[PDB]
Design a protein around this nucleic acid. Structure first.
Ligand code: MG
Ligand code: MG
Ligand code: MG
Ligand code: MG
Ligand code: MG
Ligand code: MG
Ligand code: MG
Ligand code: MG
Ligand code: MG
Ligand code: MG
Ligand code: MG
Ligand code: MG
Ligand code: MG
Ligand code: MG
Ligand code: MG
Ligand code: MG
Ligand code: MG
Ligand code: MG
Ligand code: MG
Ligand code: MG
Ligand code: MG
Ligand code: MG
Ligand code: MG
Ligand code: MG
Ligand code: MG
Ligand code: MG
Ligand code: MG
Ligand code: MG
Ligand code: MG
Ligand code: MG
Ligand code: MG
Ligand code: MG
Ligand code: MG
Ligand code: MG
Ligand code: MG
Ligand code: MG
Ligand code: MG
Ligand code: MG
Ligand code: MG
Ligand code: MG
Ligand code: MG
Ligand code: MG
Ligand code: MG
Ligand code: MG
Ligand code: MG
Ligand code: MG
Ligand code: MG
Ligand code: MG
Ligand code: MG
Ligand code: MG
Ligand code: MG
Ligand code: MG
Ligand code: MG
Ligand code: MG
Ligand code: MG
Lengths: 200, 85, 93
RNA sequence: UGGAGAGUUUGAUCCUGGCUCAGGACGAACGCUGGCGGCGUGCUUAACACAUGCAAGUCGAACGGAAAGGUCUCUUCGGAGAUACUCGAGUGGCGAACGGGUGAGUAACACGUGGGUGAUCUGCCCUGCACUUCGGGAUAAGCCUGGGAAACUGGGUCUAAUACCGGAUAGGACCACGGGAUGCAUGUCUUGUGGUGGAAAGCGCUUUAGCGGUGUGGGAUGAGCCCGCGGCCUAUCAGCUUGUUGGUGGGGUGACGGCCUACCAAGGCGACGACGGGUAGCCGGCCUGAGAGGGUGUCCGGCCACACUGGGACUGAGAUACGGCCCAGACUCCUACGGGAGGCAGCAGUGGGGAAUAUUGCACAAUGGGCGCAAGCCUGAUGCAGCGACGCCGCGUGGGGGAUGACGGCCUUCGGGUUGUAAACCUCUUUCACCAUCGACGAAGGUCCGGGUUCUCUCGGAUUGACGGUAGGUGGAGAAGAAGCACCGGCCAACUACGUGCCAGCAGCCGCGGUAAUACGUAGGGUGCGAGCGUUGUCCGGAAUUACUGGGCGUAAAGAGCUCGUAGGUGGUUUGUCGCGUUGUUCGUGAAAUCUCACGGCUUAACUGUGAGCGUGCGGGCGAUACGGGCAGACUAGAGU
């Protein structure tokens, strides 16, 4: 299931502009509601919970799925926060966001859900698939000459492209050089509080 | 019972038990006779009846009415029985 | 009798199979005496493998395979090289 | 590579110390809600009683026979003709001990782990070697009949077989005497001499269609038995044992064995828990935990036990013989009252108990299994399918813009805030659902007919899928059909108003409500989730509150009133040896599945597969002797004289 609701509301609640550009945000930077302006109690559990909600609603990830990802990130050798960010980036809607083939997350996700995407020429419609190394991020051949798919061309310059994926010309196909590690990951959020959370 | 084979199977089982009964009656009466011979210590009829006793015992073993291990057990038993007569 | 039978260890929609040696008077997903191969009939040609040097041992001692295994046994060629046929070679692809 | 705390004893404090809470899990249940799919899963209580259907059958290449089909006929016009493929009823073989269910009983070599069997069995499977040689007499079935209500059964002829009986020869029987090899003692194998002994079978043929059988040596497999270790409560169970402990001679068993028996002696077990009482199927595992532990043994898989209750044998290689037999007992049915039948803890399904867990479905398509030379028949195993959000995973119920920040709602300090880009509106695309259509993999498979040197092989042709016109691809339409649950004083994330006024009521805890309730009911807002959300119950955690890891006993609970002393535990310094503990290495085992790492594929996931760890333990060999332990000593320092 998906949230399917207001976005600037939760941006206000988490006190961080999650999406890229929002005039609805920054006008009322306080959390919404009738008690929107009250001094909240800065509790450790409070900031941890708001931080995990940040991590979820940034990528549109649901609760137990975020659980499962965290329980395999903990099990993977080394650290856990870097790999958790790695895999939640490797979700292909975030891949489209990095490639610049979308304006917002809720339509980056739907461009996958609605079956406008083949990976190795394979029809995928689940937005939770994880891109591997060297893989091709391609589109259906018949998607051409569609309004968003053609406005996707001239809107490829305002947003910087990360160095872990390569986007090419008239064949709008991405090549994933490698699985991005830590730095090229955009960081609207400090990430050790997820790590601390689930030891409770 | 119920199974078409089960009635036939019992009809064979009675045949088996009866034809087996003939044999084990024979060999029981014969081992008793051998004990009669040995207890008396005649050593002539006791010497000459072995040709019948082990004969029918091995017949029993071949037809499988009893099994060769106990067959050997009994024949060794009476062999050592006359070995002290 | 000792059997070389095809034991089912698959899902609802995938019949993966794994070949061993086991006594006939035994259920499928029981204790196999020794594992000697696998068979996945989902790829285009097949996915086939038999150990090919304990299969000879079992066939020599008397482990008779079943009717779906006998075909696969000609395919891997162990039947021909055990029976002295001129087609001793394996013929899989 | 892994450990969180908070509230509560006081006027205040610090300890001690319980209680409560925050987490996770279920074969779950109940409340509300609810779209689908995938994959798992579903009597945890009554091992309570079962209507109804199927779940064990197979061979005409074993034989006597012709009940049906079609035939060579005659010919009544609706009967004869076994000779004849084909085959009803019938005789024999194998199977039925596998397969499935339940967990009552069982505290036990029942189970887990490792060993011994020089003390053993093992049909059909493989391999090595000889033989198939003479015969006989019955009987089914059939036919004529008798009795009985039937269930079933008596009498008289007649006929076979790979059914039965008699034989000849044949070493893996025996006895005795000996050799030759090995030990671990009763003993083991290979032989010789002599004297005794035991086996069988035939069935078909297009004219190189083929099925058999018997005696044995060795494997393979299954099994039997025995043993070390391990695994609940309880002493408010201290004496248990007489075939008990052992021996001899016997019997019996497949086999050792008091397994049984005659005799003889008087032994065996136990405070390291005998005997007894209670509880309980056990396990790989599953839940929890940082681990050690604690709980538990459900799906799967392994082992055991049982099959209405209790007792016993038979056949057969193989028997708790669930759908075999004998008897007793309890329960339901028929009887013509003399007599008989039945056992769902098999697949369903019914009734009954419970809070509660499902279709009286399809296919043998695949695999495993049974039988037949084979085609083929059987398989409620198995593959599936239906129902239960019962659980896990996945995906949707729109997205980008969109202020004059619209109406309405709520609050208000009456200036406004809040719901809120959330809406109206524009614009774009159809995951899922709808209609239409094609359409599967699972089948280098299963049989027939071309060609194949025969075994084999395909050139290459027909036909065969329960799932299922299902999964899946494509076209058409338009945001169109699709969100609810819980909570908001602290733990704990989330607040104002109105209604109520110790009343209703809430609550886990401590507490709230007696006129201004952030704590009851409603509204608004919000938070956490989301096809799920809450309540219960159970268990672990927090609980270092049974403490091995990891606790304490002056006053908080806790030093016996004191001493001696039994078992036990523990033990100074030194020498040499053993190598039991300890420790090193290797070999074997520690099944598969499970858990962890890496890849691979189901659109990702759940799930699966492969390779590597895990399998902590145990057995054998080869090392070591620092410490502990045994032994043979030594010393005086402890101890005693
Ligand atoms: Mg029969
Ligand atoms: Mg008599
Ligand atoms: Mg004896
Ligand atoms: Mg006090
Ligand atoms: Mg107080
Ligand atoms: Mg306390
Ligand atoms: Mg409802
Ligand atoms: Mg499904
Ligand atoms: Mg017939
Ligand atoms: Mg049976
Ligand atoms: Mg059985
Ligand atoms: Mg039960
Ligand atoms: Mg005759
Ligand atoms: Mg003869
Ligand atoms: Mg002779
Ligand atoms: Mg035969
Ligand atoms: Mg006595
Ligand atoms: Mg004795
Ligand atoms: Mg004896
Ligand atoms: Mg019980
Ligand atoms: Mg702990
Ligand atoms: Mg079990
Ligand atoms: Mg069960
Ligand atoms: Mg019953
Ligand atoms: Mg027997
Ligand atoms: Mg029955
Ligand atoms: Mg049932
Ligand atoms: Mg009820
Ligand atoms: Mg079948
Ligand atoms: Mg089969
Ligand atoms: Mg099912
Ligand atoms: Mg479902
Ligand atoms: Mg329900
Ligand atoms: Mg989900
Ligand atoms: Mg479509
Ligand atoms: Mg809070
Ligand atoms: Mg009031
Ligand atoms: Mg309230
Ligand atoms: Mg509770
Ligand atoms: Mg504890
Ligand atoms: Mg507790
Ligand atoms: Mg203490
Ligand atoms: Mg003390
Ligand atoms: Mg005190
Ligand atoms: Mg004192
Ligand atoms: Mg003293
Ligand atoms: Mg003392
Ligand atoms: Mg002492
Ligand atoms: Mg000592
Ligand atoms: Mg010492
Ligand atoms: Mg993959
Ligand atoms: Mg994978
Ligand atoms: Mg696995
Ligand atoms: Mg294992
Ligand atoms: Mg002194």
């Amino acid at each position: 299931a998906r949230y399917t609701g207001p976005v600037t509301r939760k941006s206000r609640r988490l006190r961080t502009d999650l999406v890229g550009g929002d005039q609805a945000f920054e006008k009322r930077p306080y959390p919404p509601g009738q008690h929107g302006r009250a001094r909240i109690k800065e509790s450790e559990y409070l900031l941890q919970l708001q931080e995990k909600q940040k991590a979820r609603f940034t990528y549109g990830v649901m609760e137990k799925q975020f659980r499962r990802y965290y329980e395999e990130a903990v099990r993977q050798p080394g650290k856990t926060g870097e790999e958790l960010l790695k895999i939640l980036e490797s979700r292909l809607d975030n891949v489209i966001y990095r490639a610049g083939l979308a304006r917002t997350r809720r339509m980056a996700r739907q461009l996958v859900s609605h079956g406008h995407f083949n990976v190795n020429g394979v029809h995928v419609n689940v937005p939770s698939y994880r891109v591997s190394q060297y893989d091709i991020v391609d589109v259906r051949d018949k998607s051409l000459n569609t309004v968003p798919f053609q406005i996707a061309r001239e809107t490829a310059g305002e947003r910087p492209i990360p160095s872990w994926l390569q986007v090419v010309g008239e064949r709008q196909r991405v090549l994933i050089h490698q699985l991005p590690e830590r730095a090229q990951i955009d960081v609207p959020l400090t990430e050790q509080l997820i790590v601390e959370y689930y030891s409770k | 019972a119920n199974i078409k084979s089960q009635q036939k199977r019992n009809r064979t089982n009675e045949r088996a038990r009866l034809r087996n009964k003939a044999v084990k009656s024979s060999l029981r009466t014969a081992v008793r006779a051998f004990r009669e011979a040995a207890h008396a210590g005649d050593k002539a009829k006791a010497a000459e009846l072995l040709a019948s006793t082990n004969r029918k015992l091995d017949k029993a073993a071949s037809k499988g009415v009893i099994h060769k291990n106990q067959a050997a057990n009994k024949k060794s038993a009476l062999a050592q029985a006359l070995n002290k007569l | 009798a000792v059997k070389i039978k095809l034991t089912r260890l698959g899902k609802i929609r995938n019949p993966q199979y794994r070949v061993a040696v086991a006594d006939a008077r035994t259920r499928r997903d029981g204790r196999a005496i020794e594992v000697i191969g696998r068979y996945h009939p989902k790829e285009e040609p097949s996915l086939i493998e038999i150990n090919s040097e304990r299969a000879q041992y079992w066939l020599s001692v008397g482990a008779q395979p079943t009717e779906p295994v006998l075909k696969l046994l000609k395919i891997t060629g162990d039947w021909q090289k055990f029976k002295g046929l001129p087609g001793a070679q394996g013929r899989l692809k």
